[PDB]
RNA sequence: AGUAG
């Protein structure tokens, strides 16, 4: 049942009107939005704005501090080890000892030293032993740590702890900017100096590792990455909360470089910092000579005394992996110029790559991130005919230089960028290389931007700085309302009202004869398409019970109730579907739930979005009637836009490209030939067709506009339903969007009550609540929700403009082809030129001009600007405004094809993922982490990386993941010590290699290798019968004991198919709301008694009030209910793998006992019939986008696996009606049940009358059902076999492989 | 002092 609404009628817009006033606009001289590159042009703005900076702000004379740590190697690194330190730390102290201090920060390392040579035995002993034999002492109460009091310091040091607790550079000058170039080619040059079998091993040992791997193997760039390695896994050691009270003091090398550990504030905090200091032998490597604290003279050599540093939990986790991440970026590097030239890069090429990978990959600074930020928009800018470069290049001024690697970083991109002005070959970036390809070069500062860590801005400035836009674009929206009423910006100027002002076409106003033309010119399009439209619409779901969606029942977060103290509290959105059902006596539609929720004012909060940009983003979070209005809004848009051939983003991935291709094919063949225009009698003029591809991006798309546009435009839109209802039910779901409650978050309000004073910069953002807490915004949407229905809304207003155009110059056959997806968008104009000198062109026009046309001023000369400009105005005339800033103009496809737009399917950068894999796992376990790096670097192999680059990613990432879990050779949990087996034979989830060929993990899934010795296992003792395969059968029975406790198929991650061991790092200790609300016995019976609902969602309020409970109380969502932190996590992992008891047996003892475990249960094994039939039952040039369907499922059962199987365990009649509903093809669940049994017969003597069957396939055909998209060289078949004939022959970098 | 601004 839908509700009655009002609804909106027709105004009568006629387009006559509009070419009208176009005609009268398009007769006079209008300003083009973007200018003209040259290399003059660039050059002139670098130098004006030089000079500017001089005044914007006050110089400075001393560069600051962009290297974190400071080492210096003389000689090849051996990775340290606890039997190292206990002689290098002695050396590097005595040595210490000898020298003379003269600063605060000397005299602190001479008296930490002084102390750790006093040092006792016993005090050595329990400071350099396990924890496990750890014995507390009055001198050092913590293993790796040593208590130094208040008297042995010396008062030079007490004032430098008691110390402890805008200006820039002259860029424009010349003698400072060589100063800092020479200074950072000079540590360059010292990083780049040399220190004293399936096929694709063939063709990695060959190629790969001959040009990149054995290269840089002997560079001080390979070696001080191992030794800020060591660095910082001291630091993370040094950073608990038991140890981070006490010094410590460690060395590293053969007692050349010392790491005095300072006492600092535990990092399992969101505030805190490690502190430190580094003293090492002057050499080549990491030395800034001007920011070291102190040289110390020694007779032979000189030590370089930092300074006390200061390093958070994000750079303290960035600078862990400085290594791995250098080396995936020059991989990448080494990747793209074997495309780019056909041949390796030279010797010397590489090195340098590496050197400037790593210097960048060790200084995560936020001052930098923005610049190559800044540098990824300014480079297609000024490679492109006309672009808006003069005001990217000014925003790149708008930060201070201070340190010698921006000044550096920069004269490097104004050279860059002025010698790329010019020969409008691509110069390159980092070495002395020239390119031929647009692509290497963009993927060059690509890389280069993602070396960075995502979030360096600091916490509440950019919190701060996220809530003033939304403000101030409110306040602006209030400033139009004072002027002209509210009834002219909520529902827009008529034309004639435009005419008689034409200042009214401004962002936040939008026109009424404008909007309605739109839905009528889509209305062309939407009205062959009747039936399918209507089809579509219907096809959503309105009557499916809301909460009994997979999103409505989300971990994502949603706002809460207004509380006490005013502010909007946060949650997630299972506890809100919890609380409504829980005071709800039913569980109704979407439609049902909104008018429910009608009079309820939408609200909303900002959460930050941790990002790497420059000015943050900011997530919105909105309650639940706001979210059922957007859900009713998307619906409704969604099913419409995805019946539009021009409106991306409502493709499936694999479409946007095979659409855009088709696109400019589609340009390219109308440019192929040449139009004539009709003279007085019979002379024809022959024009030449041409193309002018323009990029475009709008300024404050959703932050800046007013949602009351798409109320004219969906009461115009053809849905082709036989009646209003549901149009007017969207209506008035848009109507209930216009206001909404901002709330400041809990922190920017806790911290302004503590300012003392409040500057005019936010006293007008704190006008703008009258409570404190909540303010009205109008007109904005709230970026991020209505975006299929902004895109189509832009696509009909491109299409008013083809008409008004065409309706313009009917004399003209142009030809525009426009592409949007959100803001993003393509306009492919094309124009004609004279093919002669002109003059008749021109004449023609003339007479034209003088017959009366006048709007043929605009016409004479470049054609395809007075074509831009009209089509600017009309979209303004819909409150859209292209940039005049990421916009791009140009002849060429390049700079787009390059970029294509900001979605999911534009690649991602290869990079990003790969970069990614390092970082940011899941913390469940070896085996869960293990499985979820392997994965994210095959999908990196899928977009586009190349077997030999994503080949070396799985192994840095295994060699990661295996240290952090100690799951390494002679450390807290290698398999091979405790366990007879050796290390490749142990199954992965006990500790295992588990290093495969990218083929493998590519072509088939990860933990395969699982089932590979679980085959080879089962084989061997059928056939052989030796005792030595029979152990691992032992390990795969204690696998299976360990996992029967788990129920549900409760997993987050890869399946195992052999279980997994159990682990747990955190639990939020705080119980959730509305988490005990039935006994935990009454959720184990419920359990039992309703099997169905462990697939297949409750339908039914008291039904699903229970299912949502247990959800709530399961040991696998609670954890990812509370995993705010990443870092957290990460940095966790590596204290909680030692003798932390993070993983149960049924008794929570440490991973080292499960190795003794299952070595006893191993050798205390024997083969029974049970143990058998089960193993047997567990072995039962031109890119283009694909899909790889692994094994997909079979065609005859037709119904979701689920579905049939819990119509199998379906006996009450709430259960068979969840079934029914949920079931996609009802009537058939029988069909799918019979086909199953006849099948189990088959492959299994297990029969599934009896459960416990059903329960072993669904992971299976879970990892079956998925389909990712690839992306291929363009030769690739669509089917799963030519993809990976294709990643076969790839292998090679530089030579084929048919 | 450092991170940040
Ligand atoms: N993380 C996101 N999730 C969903 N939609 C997003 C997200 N980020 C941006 N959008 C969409 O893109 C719009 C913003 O586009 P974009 O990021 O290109 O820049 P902008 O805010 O329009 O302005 P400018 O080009 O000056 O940066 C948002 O209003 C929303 O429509
Ligand atoms: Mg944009
Ligand atoms: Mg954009």
Same mark, same amino acid.
Not at 529 to 554: C, M
Not at 795 to 819: G, H, Y
Not at 1179 to 1191: D, E, Y
């Given at each position: ?89 002695? @050396? ?180 805190? =910092? ?69 041949? +390796? ?274 997530? +919105? ?120 409650? =901002? ?328 119980? =959730? ?27 039914? @309020? ?28 990460? =940095? ?167």
């Amino acid at each position: 049942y839908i509700p009655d609404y009002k609804g909106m009628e027709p105004i009568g817009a006629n387009i006559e009107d509009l070419v009208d006033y176009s005609k009268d606009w398009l007769s006079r001289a209008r300003n083009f939005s973007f200018f003209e590159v040259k290399g003059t042009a660039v050059f002139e703005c670098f130098n004006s704005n030089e000079a500017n900076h001089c005044q914007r702000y006050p110089m400075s004379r001393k560069p600051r501090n962009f290297l974190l740590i400071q080492c210096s190697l003389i000689t090849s690194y051996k990775p340290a080890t606890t039997l190292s330190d206990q002689i290098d730390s002695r @050396r590097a102290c005595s040595y210490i000892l000898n020298l003379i201090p003269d600063t605060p920060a000397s005299y602190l390392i001479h008296d930490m030293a002084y102390r750790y040579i006093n040092l006792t035995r016993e005090d050595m002993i329990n400071y350099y032993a396990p924890r496990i034999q750890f014995k507390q002492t009055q001198n050092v109460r913590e293993p790796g740590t040593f208590k130094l009091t208040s008297s042995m310091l010396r008062a030079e040091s007490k004032a430098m702890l008691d110390l402890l607790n805008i200006e820039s550079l002259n860029i424009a000058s010349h003698i400072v900017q060589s100063e800092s170039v020479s200074l950072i080619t000079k540590i360059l040059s010292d990083l780049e100096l040399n220190i004293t079998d399936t096929v694709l091993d063939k063709f990695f040992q060959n190629e790969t590792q001959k040009y990149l791997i054995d290269v840089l193997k002997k560079t001080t760039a390979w070696h001080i990455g191992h030794l800020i390695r060591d660095i910082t896994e001291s630091l993370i050691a040094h950073s608990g909360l038991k140890r981070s009270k006490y010094w410590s003091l460690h060395s590293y090398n053969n007692g050349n470089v010392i790491l005095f550990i300072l006492p600092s504030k535990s990092l399992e905090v969101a505030g805190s =910092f490690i502190r430190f200091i580094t003293v090492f032998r002057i050499g080549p490597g990491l030395v800034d000579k001007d920011n070291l604290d102190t040289i110390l003279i020694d007779g032979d050599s000189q030590w370089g005394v930092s300074k006390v540093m200061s390093i958070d939990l994000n750079r303290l986790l960035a600078l862990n992996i400085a290594f791995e991440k250098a080396l995936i970026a020059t991989a990448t590097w080494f990747q793209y110029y074997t495309e780019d030239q056909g041949q +390796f890069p030279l010797q010397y090429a590489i090195r340098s790559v590496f050197a400037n990978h790593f210097l960048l990959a060790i200084c995560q600074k936020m001052k930098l991130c923005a610049i190559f930020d800044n540098l990824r928009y300014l480079i297609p800018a000024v490679t492109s005919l006309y672009s808006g470069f003069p005001s990217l290049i000014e925003k790149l001024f708008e930060r201070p230089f201070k340190s010698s690697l921006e000044v550096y970083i920069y004269y490097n991109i104004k050279s860059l960028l002025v010698a790329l002005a010019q020969n409008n070959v691509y110069p390159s970036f980092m070495s002395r290389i020239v390119y031929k390809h647009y692509r290497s070069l963009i993927s060059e500062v690509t890389t280069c931007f993602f070396l960075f860590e995502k979030g360096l801005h600091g916490n509440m400035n950019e919190e701060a700085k996220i809530h003033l836009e939304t403000v101030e674009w409110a306040l602006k929206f209030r400033e139009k309302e004072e002027k002209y009423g509210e009834s002219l910006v909520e529902n827009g100027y008529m034309m004639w009202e435009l005419r008689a002002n034409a200042e009214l076409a401004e962002q936040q106003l939008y026109c009424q004869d404008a909007i309605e033309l739109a839905a009528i010119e889509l209305n062309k399009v939407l009205a062959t398409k009747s039936s399918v439209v209507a089809n579509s619409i219907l096809s959503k779901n309105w009557e499916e019970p809301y909460f009994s969606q997979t999103r409505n029942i989300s971990l994502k977060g949603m706002s809460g109730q207004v509380q006490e103290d005013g502010h909007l509290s946060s949650s997630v959105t299972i506890i809100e579907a919890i609380r409504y059902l829980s005071n709800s006596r039913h569980n109704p539609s979407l439609l049902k739930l909104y008018e429910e929720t009608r009079e309820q004012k939408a609200m909303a909060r900002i959460v930050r979005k941790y990002q790497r940009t420059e000015a943050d983003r900011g997530f +919105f979070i909105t309650t639940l009637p706001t979210r059922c209005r957007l859900e009713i809004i998307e619906d409704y848009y969604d099913a419409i836009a995805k019946n539009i051939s021009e409106e991306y983003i409502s493709y499936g991935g694999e479409k946007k490209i095979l659409a855009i291709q088709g696109a400019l094919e589609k340009a390219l063949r109308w440019a192929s030939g040449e139009s004539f225009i009709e003279l007085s009698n019979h002379k024809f003029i022959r024009m030449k067709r041409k193309l002018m591809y323009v990029s475009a991006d709008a300024t404050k798309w959703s932050p800046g506009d007013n949602s009351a546009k798409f109320r004219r435009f969906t009461s115009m839109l053809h849905n082709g339903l036989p009646n209003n209802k549901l149009k007017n039910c969207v209506i008035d779901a848009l109507k209930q969007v216009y206001k909404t409650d =901002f709330f400041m978050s809990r922190k920017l309000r806790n911290y302004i009550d503590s300012m003392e004073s409040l500057d005019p910069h936010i006293k007008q953002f704190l006008d703008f609540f009258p409570d404190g807490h909540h303010g009205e915004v109008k007109g904005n949407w709230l970026q991020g929700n209505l975006n299929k229905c902004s895109s189509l809304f832009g696509v009909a207003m491109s299409l008013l403009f083809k008409q008004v155009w065409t309706n313009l110059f009917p004399e003209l056959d142009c030809f525009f082809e426009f592409a949007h997806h959100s803001d993003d968008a393509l306009f492919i104009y094309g124009y004609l030129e004279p093919v002669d000198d002109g003059t008749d062109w021109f004449l023609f026009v003339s007479q034209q001009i003088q017959a009366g046309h006048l709007h043929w001023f605009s016409v004479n000369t470049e054609m395809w600007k007075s074509m831009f400009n009209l089509h600017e105005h009309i979209l303004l005339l819909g409150s859209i405004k292209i940039s005049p800033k990421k916009t791009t103009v140009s002849p060429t496809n390049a700079e787009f094809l390059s970029t294509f737009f900001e979605g999911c399917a534009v690649s991602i950068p290869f990079v990003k993922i790969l970069l990614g894999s390092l970082s940011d796992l899941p913390g469940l376990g070896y085996f869960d982490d293990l499985a979820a790096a392997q994965s994210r670097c095959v999908k990196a192999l899928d977009l586009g990386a190349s077997p030999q680059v994503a080949q070396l990613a799985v192994a840095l990432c295994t060699s990661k993941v295996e240290r952090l879990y100690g799951t390494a050779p002679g450390m807290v949990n290698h398999p091979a010590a405790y366990l007879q087996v050796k290390h490749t034979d142990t199954p992965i989830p006990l500790g295992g290699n588990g290093a495969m060929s990218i083929m493998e993990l590519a072509t088939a899934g990860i933990g395969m290798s699982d089932k590979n010795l679980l085959k080879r296992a089962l084989l061997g003792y059928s056939h052989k019968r030796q005792k030595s395969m029979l152990y691992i059968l032992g390990l795969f029975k204690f696998l299976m004991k360990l996992s029967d406790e788990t129920f549900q198929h409760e997993r987050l991650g890869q399946f195992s198919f052999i279980g997994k061991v159990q682990w747990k790092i955190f639990t939020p200790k705080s119980e =959730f709301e509305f988490a005990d609300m039935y006994t935990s016995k009454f959720l184990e019976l419920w359990s039992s008694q309703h099997v169905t609902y462990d697939y297949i969602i409750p339908k039914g @309020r008291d039904n699903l009030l229970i299912y949502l409970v247990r959800k709530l109380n399961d040991p696998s969502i609670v954890t990812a209910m509370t995993m705010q932190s990443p870092l957290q996590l990460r =940095f966790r992992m590596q204290a909680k793998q030692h003798m932390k008891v993070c993983r149960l047996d049924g008794e929570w003892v440490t991973f080292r006992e499960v190795l003794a475990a299952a070595n006893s249960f191993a050798e205390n094994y024997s083969a029974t019939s049970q143990d058998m039939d089960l193993f047997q039952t567990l072995t039962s040039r031109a890119k283009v986008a694909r899909t790889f369907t692994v094994r997909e499922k079979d065609q005859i059962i037709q119904n979701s696996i689920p579905a049939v199987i819990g119509y199998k365990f379906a006996v009450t009649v709430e259960e068979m009606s969840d079934v029914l509903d949920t079931a996609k093809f009802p009537d058939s669940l029988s069909v799918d049940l019979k086909t199953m049994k006849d099948g189990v017969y088959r492959e299994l003597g297990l029969d599934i009358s009896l459960p416990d069957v059903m329960k072993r396939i669904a992971p299976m055909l879970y990892k079956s059902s998925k389909s990712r998209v690839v992306i291929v060289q363009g030769n690739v078949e669509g089917t799963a076999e030519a993809i990976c004939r294709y990643w076969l022959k790839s292998m090679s970098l530089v030579k084929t492989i048919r």
